[PDB]
Amino acid sequence: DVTAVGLTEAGHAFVPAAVDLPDGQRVWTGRLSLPSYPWLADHQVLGQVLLPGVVWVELALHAGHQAGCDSVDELTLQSPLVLGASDTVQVRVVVTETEEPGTRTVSMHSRRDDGSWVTHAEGILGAGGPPPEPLPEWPPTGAMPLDVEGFYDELAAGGYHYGPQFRCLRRAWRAGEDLVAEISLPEGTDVDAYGLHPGLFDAAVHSVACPRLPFAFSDVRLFATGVTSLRVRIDPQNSSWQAWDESGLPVLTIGRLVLRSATGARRQ
Amino acid sequence: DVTAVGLTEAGHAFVPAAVDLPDGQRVWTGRLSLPSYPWLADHQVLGQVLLPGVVWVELALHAGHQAGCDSVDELTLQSPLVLGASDTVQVRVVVTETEEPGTRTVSMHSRRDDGSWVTHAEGILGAGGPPPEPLPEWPPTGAMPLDVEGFYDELAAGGYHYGPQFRCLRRAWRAGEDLVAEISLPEGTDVDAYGLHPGLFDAAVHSVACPRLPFAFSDVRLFATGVTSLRVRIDPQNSSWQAWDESGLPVLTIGRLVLRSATGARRQ
């Protein structure tokens, strides 16, 4: 119970404590390791366990909401975080007020014991945004069912080995020039301490493949927490995402997402 | 156990946790209240429970030692901290690296729930200092015993009501132009989680009265922890302190100390 040491319970699985500072700064803190979250081993690229980049967006959405900034105006990923089998890593989310109210900087960092701080993401938290649009029918129509059989075996062949907690893609269609998909977590996935569980958040992004890593995010908003199943619409003409729950209520919008390509401890 | 939230156990009663930050900053954090440390009610000035100013020096000595800076080059007190009967207060000690190694800034802050941050002290942590001198005989000789009967009743009459944990002065002599004193904690005082227990630290300073508050500290060094009884020598020609334990081993030096005179919640 962190209030006994003058901190605030922060209500997130990855950053359970928050440290208000006289800076106008607020810092969310946690410890990441595979024994604490074994399902993190289900995100392995080229034999390395990497923290999914969408984890840093999820943390920004959580910190920004707690700070009054319901929008991730901008988040840019930098160095990846590789989790060894033995590794334990301190994590920080640092939110800093600016000279313009309603706009705050955010940065994400980690540190291993015998090591220095590493910056994993930097960005800007903002107020509000465009309202989401409704889901008038599902699936969209004139939409052709796509064969997603062995979709994950295909990704594995290109080096992206998605484990049980990340194999969330269930059905997909081509809808005009857009991609639409049903994506859902395995049954019994605990999502209480997340805004959007990383495995479902990641499958929302990696479904664009019907094998790359997210790089830069613009205008991300989360409208609902605790969602375990999504209906997703992806538009590559400005690489944007909309997600609704099974009843069509809005869950997530990404105004723009740009991807990128491929150090680290040794495997096994 | 704060390591589970990515922090460090800091080993001090008032600041049990430390937050390393990528700033090069390190922050010690705690919660202060009279139910957690009821002996803090034993330091009451003009009816107000004030945190003794020497608490901020003790915290600086603890943080500086953990950061490699064995000297409080400089600490200047600002706003006092008044503890209400009901009050709970978050405290921070913020240590920041500078452009000159071996020298770091330190600042002390508090915040009540419905309130803003308040700065209680600012200063500079440094490396090393002058070595302490030995204690060749005790008491010093040609030293005349001073009557310290009702010393605390006298202080009370001027508004300084020292309670059991702070009534540590036992014997005093005039030694030439210097003051020397034996000062010790009540039996059974737990000092495990302090460098120098605040009640004994404060009695070292307030013994100068054979009724004022500390203001500015220069060149403070703590040579030993866990001491419960002190032999003290005060020199008003540069308002300096030396303290040894009962066996003459060095405990504390204050290179220079300047005092000062007299908001707050309502008593009772």
Author numbering:
A (entry chain A), B (entry chain A): 31 to 239, 301 to 359
Q: Could you pull the original sentences from the published paper?
A:
The borrelidin PKS from Streptomyces parvulus Tü4055 utilizes a rare trans-cyclopentane-1,2-dicarboxylate starter unit. The first DH domain, isolated from the third module in the borrelidin PKS, is specific towards a trans-cyclopentane-carboxylate-containing polyketide substrate. In the case of BorA DH M3, we were unable to model 11 residues between α3 and β11, suggesting a highly flexible region within the DH domain. A lack of modeled residues between α3 and β11 is also observed in the erythromycin M4, phthiocerol dimycocerosate, curacin F and the rifamycin M10 DH domains. Surprisingly, the same flexible loop region between α3 and β11, where residues are either missing (BorA DH M3) or have higher B-factors (FluA DH M1), form part of the acyl-binding region. From the catalytic Asp located in α3 to a conserved Pro in β11, the residues between them form part of the bottom of the substrate-binding cavity responsible for binding to the acyl-ACP intermediates past the C-3 hydroxyacyl position. The lack of 11 unmodeled residues in the BorA DH M3 acyl intermediate-binding region would yield inconclusive in silico docking results. Therefore, we opted not to conduct substrate docking analysis with the BorA DH M3 model. However, no electron density for the corresponding substrates was observed. The lack of substrate binding may be due to high specificity of both BorA DH M3 and FluA DH M1 for their native PPant-tethered polyketide intermediates 1, 4.
